């Protein structure tokens, strides 16, 4: 007659590492790291992302005539920008504070497009001849940004002082754009805006802007040796904007009522497909469906994700050393 | 193992004991059988479950990297952001990998100790009445039926009830 | 006859947590985290903080006529700015590099106000008519910044080229300010500074500045459609400043000898009372009096404080498991 | 406990032993009484005091957040600063909370081991001369007056001095 | 020590045992001598070597500070960079210093446990046939030549072969 | 007859600390921290560093006439700049985006100097009289930057519109420099560039620049009350640069083909000797030769270095507690 004391053994071949010992087979364990993803973009909080497709952020928000599919109101849980998108700034020139603009847009959730300055705002000038073959649409060789208007002096007169005002009486901040044209020579200048020293001046309660054309021939881009300095700002609720120019003004026309996300906001640069699915965790390289604590898929995500870590495995022993006999 | 029980003086585990981590194999006139010690098993399950959840709970924050861009003339801040992100990624990877190695070592010691303490618990009850074979097994100097077996397992073994019979067979 | 081995038990109900077990009562323990504060501001190194009261940093340092209580020399262990302070920039316009200016001031310890350019510096111009109802004092409806002087051309003459020079022969860096006026129209311009192209130019051994007025009507703020671009710089010991303008100059008048703190420097935005007390650790939300290692009161402090942490308790066991019978 | 003494084979503590962590209860013709083992108590106080101070000393740096402001066009660096500050706040909270849980578990094991080793220390001296009741108590097979008691406590117990008397009563 | 062996019931080490960490001193008719237990020594060397390499491997990243400069009007980002660098320097110093203190404490316990388990391993084989002096030494109740000594050391000691001779001398 | 169980003791006096105990002597241990360095600079990947000697980065890359020893092509594993180097910007003025320029140069590995605009590029102007005693060489009191050319109008004529173009047809980006002169008065202006409103305009496919002289007397530095605004840019492979000015142009003359390091890149500010030796790890305070995991020598290094830490010692126990008897 006898009684023995002993411990569990099983068919497990799963191993863990310890400080003293590698590859120890244990009866029970738990993996804390997720290495699996669904290679696609899904909805977050049942809200679809915004696919830019063949437009860049600049082309979308400026109103590049080839980004008309996107034109108007948009809501999004995040933004997918495609790596080799072609439709951005068509008429050569720099978008000022571009990186700050992208960060701002990324912090958003919804834009409502609206006419801020009807062309009737600008008195004694031409608002119908501001096109270029630098900016074609899909139907004409010569168009221009939907949200801007290229102002040219009329028939043969001078370019007079034009003025504009918008009072933000709404509850939302307004994202808007404008430009200054820089002709390649003094003839083009004279032919478009006439003679004299020209300026573009803008001001709000908290912002004021002043620029003058800088005439010189730059290398040709999209057939143009001239340039445009694009600009952007945010007109706060309760603020009013004053515009004043006597030439070289690319005027704001349409603008955006901007809803800022309370959350995080993401801009994913990816060529991954957007499918019809829901998710709680969306990384730039795919969706995670886990209850796990760690993941080695990506540090870039939107939603509620596990902690990013470089490890291949974080296997925690729970059972004891497996010693079957 | 530092307690010397698991893969020690008790050389192997029991595939035949399927209902718990620690337990007994008994053998008498009514036959043989395995049985888990539910109390020490449950206590261990509770401790280890607590350890796992505590780790999960402390690792329940995330450092968030951003998609922010930087121009050609923002090389300094661009690289600051990069070194920062890589910075936290390195400390958290370290924290996770090191914790797991440390915790695995201590988890295995815990089990080792528990098996060890269960063995001592039985040795302390039997004393004279059984012979310790040095492998976790005790041979009784008396007849131990099913209720005697169960008394050893719930810690109510009656030493003086069996000492005369044991002493006779022992000497 | 007998001897037993055993362990201490007591009346303790204090508990700690372990990795294996929550709410374990122990005989002795020690709390490492402080959660208590005195909701007030005190002295640090027996040095009182500077209360701005109803002035903002800008209003104080520019010499807003309603910040005269603060006007002159100040020493401080830190700065308390009040959340709804009204007296800042009275005449509308932007203070350039504002955030950098605040960080600079925060790194300080003492300012000594002094006259840098007496109004006698500016020859052939009027220095007595530079007021506005945008900047009232508590006694007149029309005043101006104590540290600046608004220069206007005389009687009917032209605004000539005025000049100024200061050579920092002292041991301390000098914090000073200046502005450029931007009139709403060309009449106001002409009426104040006369005809011609105007400029404000400034230069030291390491700094040079040039600006010209930008004439346009901005939305009205404090009754003004005009603007001023305020500026600031630091004249290093041994450097000299040259001023040269022919109009639109808001001149530096009084400036500050600036003592930089060797320590940390803080600017607290709070409505907490400053009382007559000493402290070694001052957070933005109150004083800590502890010998403890951690605290969950605030990450923002001045002085020698415990490490900030989000925990509610960091109780370390010292004694053993309490099992009384 | 992994050493099986505290709240184990010694089921409870002693409210009556007020002058230390580990010690003895004796009982003879002159009566009963508690007494701390000062040596093992002091050694434990010293170790644990060292652990507490070492932790305090390593946690003796502070990450310092700033009151610096950022304009509307410094959203990127403003958020970099925020993520950095929140970054270090998260690692230090983790470090503190995890250390405390780990250290508390090991502190309690230390005491458990110390009580266990004190019991073994006494068992090793008595051997034959006393009966182990399995609860930390030893019944002497001989008369142990106050000096005999004190000899057991300072580790100078004289086994051969009492073995004849013990053996007679034992058998 | 928490296992009570090293600088415990075995009061000191042996300068005379030079070929390992744990081992034996034997004494019989052919004389005296030291010998390491290669198996438990090697196992300990392997564990500890693994611990050292695992630590080195986890500490195998570097945070990199930069020589980047900042103008008078970049005080905010300049100080952000400084606080970040000092930030990571502080967590890594903490991680290293704390790990070393923790690991040293557990390394010494490991050895203590190993010596303890080796002693138990020998006690379990001898049982009756030898007298435990309470200091890691066993006096045989029989003659143990060189092969008998070696059998105890490789765990093949033959208890029943010597029990008659032992029992005679013991009683 | 008897057998005893026991443990190793030895002659070790080496100690470690534990959480429970300080100064514990152990039989075997291992130090993980290196505190030793060779106080010198060596080669990294058998590649020598670049010693600036008595030139600063600005003086070297602008072509300060006293930095001729450095003039031309350079390859480097890292850059050693000397603390009290005197040869930098000789003609007073600011190098724009200086800190960004240093970071850029630091990311490099090799520069190839080449003539970008021969003086023949500039038609109808003088390219032979652009010297100053602000910038002496070691042989003449009046020289100028080797990579720039100070353009002055000819004999008595006007300063006409000069133009220049370079098309980067190579595979490497090109680092180049230019300036705008700011005379102290209107006479010097007229005497050098003639009458009229002057400008300097530059443009590429992605960059455009425009500046006009700002005439004022600044404090004298190196005998000059005038200033120069220095500038720099990088012409990408495939880009072309257009230059257009009618005066006040300090023209680009020689430029650099720039090879960017794949690695890290360092600029060490030190007075340490560069010797003839090889290294794998070079800190700013000296060389490390270790197989160790940690070091408390410096956080600043190039090559493969151990982790920087503030500790004096990180001694890990391996053997047991040493208790000889
Ligand atoms: C070959 C070449 O580069 N030719 C350009 C020309 O330079 C001349 C040289 O050819 C010649 O060797 O030397 C000359 C001096 O001696 C000149 O340097 O310069 C002209 C303009 O002065 C260029 O014409 C432009 O060519 C473009 C080609 O893509 C394009 O056709 C331009 O037309 C548009 C446009 O689509 O953007 C026509 C638009 O209706 C008009 N829109 C508006 C609202 O004005 C614009 C606008 O006038 C300009 O964009 C303003 O810069 O122009 C055409 O102007 C020629 O390419
Ligand atoms: C209702 C309104 O906005 N009126 C302002 C006026 O605009 C005209 C319109 O009313 C009208 O419908 O259409 C006109 C064109 O057809 C105009 O657009 O413009 C004048 C100035 O041109 C404004 O006068 C200003 O009103 C202010 C009200 O708060 C204030 O009274 C200004 O006076 C001061 C001042 O306190 O700042 C008087 C100071 O002595 C003087 N200081 C100095 C040193 O010059 C200043 C200074 O002249 C200006 O601040 C420079 O911009 O002005 C008064 O100028 C009117 O409000
Ligand atoms: C004592 C003093 O500062 N004098 C400078 C003088 O100011 C005048 C005052 O002396 C007088 O009290 O009041 C006057 C008005 O009423 C004046 O304010 O101004 C002249 C220039 O207008 C200064 O002459 C400069 O002196 C320099 C001393 O280091 C130096 O000799 C300058 O010569 C060079 C040069 O080496 O840089 C000669 C170069 O050949 C020439 N290079 C080129 C390519 O032009 C340059 C160049 O003309 C200037 O650098 C452009 O600013 O000048 C000399 O111009 C006098 O010091
Ligand atoms: C631990 O195990 C022991 C042994 O099995 C348990 O004691 C046993 O409990 C049952 C019911 O409580 C007893 O059965 C009864 O036997 C008596 C005659 O002795 C009979 O009159 C009743 O009708 C019933 O059949 C059994 O005798 C008893 N054994 C003893 C005490 O000698 C015990 O319940 C377990 N203890 C714990 C901690 O639960
Ligand atoms: C540990 O405890 C033992 C037992 O109490 C201590 O030994 C005792 O020490 C005292 C004084 O050293 C002795 O008292 C003396 O007794 C003799 C007669 O035996 C008498 O001539 C003297 O005048 C005095 O009264 C006592 O006898 C002695 N017991 C022994 C050794 O049998 C001992 O001091 C303690 N050891 C340590 C580690 O301190
Ligand atoms: C552990 O140590 C024991 C004791 O030294 C070892 O057993 C011994 O092994 C040798 C050779 O295997 C035996 O020597 C032989 O003796 C017989 C006569 O008994 C003789 O006929 C042969 O020519 C040879 O001399 C020795 O007897 C034997 N002792 C025993 C088994 O009683 C054993 O090898 C070691 N075990 C391990 C785990 O390696
Ligand atoms: C040991 O570990 C690695 C994974 O870390 C595994 O690939 C290898 O096969 C293991 N060796 C054993 C014991 O099978
Ligand atoms: C329009 O804006 C002006 C500021 O110029 C403001 O005073 C007014 O209240 C706004 N309109 C309404 C209806 O409030
Ligand atoms: C367990 O812990 C919480 C605090 O963490 C406490 O509020 C609760 O009352 C505790 N339960 C017990 C055992 O009293
Ligand atoms: C005044 O400043 C000038 C620089 O323009 C300097 O040369 C001079 O030394 C200063 N005054 C004194 C007394 O040094
Ligand atoms: C204890 O430690 C310090 C180094 O930390 C050493 O200087 C001192 O001499 C040591 N004391 C002993 C035991 O020698
Ligand atoms: C020279 O640059 C122009 C851009 O202006 C480019 O079109 C041309 O291809 C370049 N030269 C060659 C040989 O490609």
């Amino acid at each position: 007659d006898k009684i023995c004391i002993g411990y569990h053994a099983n068919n497990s071949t799963t191993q863990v590492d310890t400080l003293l010992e590698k590859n120890v087979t244990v009866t029970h364990s738990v993996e804390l790291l997720e290495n699996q993803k669904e290679k696609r973009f899904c909805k977050i909080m049942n809200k679809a992302p915004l696919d830019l497709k063949d437009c860049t952020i600049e082309g979308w928000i400026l109103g590049n005539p080839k980004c008309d599919l996107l034109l108007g109101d948009q809501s999004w849980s995040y933004i997918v920008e495609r790596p080799n998108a072609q439709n951005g700034i068509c008429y050569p020139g720099v978008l000022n504070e571009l990186e700050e603009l992208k960060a701002f847009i990324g912090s958003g959730e919804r834009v409502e497009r609206f006419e801020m300055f009807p062309k009737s705002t600008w008195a004694g000038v031409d608002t119908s001849r501001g096109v270029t073959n630098a900016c074609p649409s899909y139907t004409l060789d010569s168009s221009f940004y939907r949200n801007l208007v290229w102002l040219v002096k009329t028939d043969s007169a001078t370019y007079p002082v034009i003025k504009g005002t918008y009072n933000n009486t709404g509850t939302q901040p307004i994202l808007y754009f404008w430009g200054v044209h820089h002709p390649l020579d003094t003839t083009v200048q004279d032919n478009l805006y006439g003679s004299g020293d020209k300026y573009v001046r803008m001001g709000t309660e908290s912002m004021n802007f002043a620029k003058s054309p800088e005439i010189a021939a730059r290398p040709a881009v999209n057939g143009q040796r001239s340039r445009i300095d694009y600009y952007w700002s945010v007109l706060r609720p309760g603020e009013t904007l004053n515009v004043e120019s006597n030439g070289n003004l690319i005027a704001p026309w349409y603008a955006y009522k901007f809803v800022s996300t309370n959350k995080k906001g993401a801009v994913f640069k990816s060529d991954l497909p957007i499918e019809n699915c829901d998710a709680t965790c969306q990384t730039i390289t795919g969706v995670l469906r886990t209850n796990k604590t760690f993941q080695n898929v990506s540090p870039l995500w939107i939603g509620e994700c596990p902690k990013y870590v470089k490890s291949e495995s974080l296997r925690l022993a729970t059972g004891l050393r497996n010693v079957p006999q | 193992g530092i307690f010397g029980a698991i893969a020690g003086f008790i050389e192997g585990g029991w595939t035949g004991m399927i209902d718990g981590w620690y337990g007994y194999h008994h053998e008498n006139s009514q036959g043989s059988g395995y049985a888990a010690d539910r109390e020490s098993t449950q206590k261990a399950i509770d401790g280890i479950t607590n350890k796992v959840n505590s780790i999960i709970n402390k690792m329940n924050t995330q450092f968030e990297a951003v998609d922010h861009e930087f121009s050609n003339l923002e090389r300094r801040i661009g690289n600051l952001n990069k070194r920062m992100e890589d910075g936290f990624l390195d400390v958290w990877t370290y924290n996770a990998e090191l914790l797991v190695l440390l915790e695995n070592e201590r988890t295995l010691d815990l089990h080792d100790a528990n098996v060890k303490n269960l063995y001592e618990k039985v040795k302390s009850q039997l004393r004279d009445n059984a012979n310790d074979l040095g492998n976790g097994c005790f041979e009784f100097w008396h007849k131990c039926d099913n209720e005697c077996m169960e008394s050893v397992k719930n810690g109510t073994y009656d030493y003086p009830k069996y000492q005369k019979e044991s002493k006779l067979n022992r000497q």
Side-chain angles (χ1 to χ4, degrees), chain A, chain B:
Chain A
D1 281 10
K2 55 184 298 184
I3 188 163
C4 304
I5 288 82
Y7 47 96
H8 186 65
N10 63 18
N11 66 352
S12 174
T13 57
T14 300
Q15 308 173 319
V16 301
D17 292 337
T18 80
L19 280 166
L20 300 170
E21 226 167 328
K22 286 176 185 172
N23 292 338
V24 182
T25 305
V26 292
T27 64
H28 307 83
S29 60
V30 51
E31 171 65 70
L32 305 175
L33 184 142
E34 187 50 271
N35 59 354
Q36 232 63 26
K37 69 275 170 63
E38 300 172 354
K39 314 224 298 171
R40 63 184 185 170
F41 292 115
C42 299
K43 295 181 273 183
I44 292 299
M45 305 281 274
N46 206 246
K47 185 165 186 176
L50 178 61
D51 193 358
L52 292 186
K53 276 137 182 172
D54 200 29
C55 289
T56 71
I57 291 180
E58 305 100 284
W60 158 48
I61 212 71
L62 284 181
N64 183 314
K66 286 185 176 174
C67 305
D68 278 343
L69 174 58
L70 300 172
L71 193 76
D73 306 340
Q74 294 290 356
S75 280
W76 67 91
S77 52
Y78 58 96
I79 295 173
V80 177
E81 189 184 6
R82 306 310 184 164
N84 296 320
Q86 295 288 65
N87 303 316
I89 291 172
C90 50
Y91 200 96
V94 177
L95 220 187
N96 223 69
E97 302 285 358
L98 176 60
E99 292 73 17
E100 278 291 315
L101 173 66
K102 290 181 175 181
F104 172 73
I105 288 176
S107 74
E109 176 182 320
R110 166 164 187 79
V111 294
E112 289 182 18
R113 189 164 177 270
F114 72 103
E115 199 176 31
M116 194 181 187
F117 295 102
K119 316 207 213 191
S120 88
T121 273
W122 320 113
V125 279
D126 190 32
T127 66
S128 46
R129 216 155 291 116
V131 301
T132 170
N133 46 20
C135 301
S137 67
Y138 283 131
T139 53
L140 12 151
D141 309 89
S142 300
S143 201
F144 201 63
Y145 306 99
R146 308 293 177 198
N147 300 329
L148 298 181
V149 49
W150 192 344
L151 307 181
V152 173
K153 82 185 200 306
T154 23
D155 59 35
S156 301
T158 67
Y159 196 130
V161 178
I162 58 186
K163 287 183 181 175
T165 300
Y166 185 89
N167 181 8
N168 192 346
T169 55
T171 55
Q172 307 133 133
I174 291 174
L175 176 63
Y176 66 97
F177 308 85
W178 75 97
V180 177
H181 189 240
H182 304 275
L184 67 143
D185 60 52
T186 43
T187 79
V188 175
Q189 170 73 9
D190 207 292
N191 286 23
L192 264 44
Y193 319 105
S195 122
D197 295 328
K198 304 308 187 172
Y199 62 92
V200 172
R201 286 165 189 140
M202 285 183 163
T204 68
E205 284 83 352
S206 68
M207 188 280 288
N208 53 74
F209 167 92
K211 234 226 154 51
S212 301
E214 301 161 355
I215 303 182
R218 290 86 179 187
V221 179
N222 297 337
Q224 318 298 327
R225 307 265 295 182
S226 300
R227 290 297 187 268
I228 292 184
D229 276 331
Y230 305 86
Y231 295 96
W232 69 273
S233 182
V234 171
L235 186 69
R236 303 169 201 169
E239 281 186 342
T240 101
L241 166 67
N242 285 336
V243 185
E244 186 188 328
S245 177
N246 65 340
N248 305 83
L249 173 65
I250 311 303
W253 183 12
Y254 285 86
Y256 297 97
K257 274 146 185 180
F258 186 89
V259 191
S260 168
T261 200
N262 152 258
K263 319 303 174 208
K264 183 181 175 181
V267 175
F268 292 150
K269 232 132 308 148
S270 179
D271 55 326
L272 286 184
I274 306 183
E275 299 183 8
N276 191 22
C277 53
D278 254 320
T280 39
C281 171
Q282 178 73 66
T283 80
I284 192 180
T285 61
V287 182
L288 307 187
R289 293 183 205 282
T290 357
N291 59 330
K292 279 170 196 173
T293 320
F294 303 99
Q295 55 95 6
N296 63 0
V297 175
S298 172
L300 254 31
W301 69 78
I302 193 64
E304 304 300 272
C305 288
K307 166 173 284 143
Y308 180 63
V309 114
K310 312 223 290 186
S311 326
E312 291 294 349
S313 180
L314 291 166
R315 179 143 229 132
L316 216 44
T318 57
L320 40 147
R321 185 187 295 268
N322 196 32
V323 197
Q325 38 178 7
Chain B
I2 68 181
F3 296 91
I6 294 186
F9 73 88
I10 307 173
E11 294 164 60
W14 292 336
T15 52
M17 190 177 67
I18 67 186
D19 54 326
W21 279 337
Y22 330 114
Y24 314 87
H25 178 86
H26 81 270
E27 201 181 314
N28 62 7
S29 301
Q30 275 54 263
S32 306
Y34 295 96
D37 187 75
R38 295 187 329 276
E39 192 228 16
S40 64
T41 292
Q42 190 56 52
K43 191 199 173 189
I45 291 168
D46 294 340
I48 283 152
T49 301
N50 194 86
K51 174 191 294 199
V52 172
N53 293 335
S54 298
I55 292 175
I56 288 170
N57 181 68
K58 299 315 177 186
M59 292 293 195
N60 194 17
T61 56
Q62 297 81 34
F63 171 82
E64 300 196 89
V66 296
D67 43 75
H68 285 162
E69 298 190 338
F70 300 91
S71 69
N72 283 329
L73 294 174
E74 299 175 314
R75 172 176 243 100
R76 291 166 302 143
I77 59 176
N79 172 253
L80 198 164
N81 182 67
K82 190 231 179 59
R83 281 153 47 232
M84 186 202 61
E85 290 174 355
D86 293 353
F88 286 116
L89 175 53
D90 288 344
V91 355
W92 284 114
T93 303
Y94 166 83
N95 285 345
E97 286 173 2
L98 201 275
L99 182 61
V100 165
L101 294 179
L102 171 63
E103 287 317 310
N104 287 347
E105 175 183 334
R106 309 180 58 253
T107 290
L108 303 185
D109 289 335
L110 172 70
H111 293 306
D112 193 14
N114 290 336
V115 172
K116 177 66 174 308
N117 297 321
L118 192 64
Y119 160 85
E120 297 291 327
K121 201 173 159 298
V122 170
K123 178 201 254 304
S124 180
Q125 291 189 95
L126 305 185
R127 10 217 305 174
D128 284 286
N129 292 352
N131 183 32
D132 190 343
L133 305 177
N135 63 344
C137 287
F138 296 94
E139 283 183 356
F140 289 90
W141 291 118
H142 66 84
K143 279 285 137 53
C144 200
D145 59 21
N146 289 0
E147 282 179 352
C148 175
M149 288 303 185
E150 196 56 42
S151 67
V152 180
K153 297 185 225 170
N154 62 24
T156 62
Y157 175 76
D158 202 314
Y159 174 86
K161 167 175 175 171
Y162 300 101
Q163 66 160 304
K164 308 180 185 65
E165 175 183 353
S166 304
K167 179 181 173 187
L168 227 126
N169 296 317
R170 188 192 328 125
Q171 294 165 357

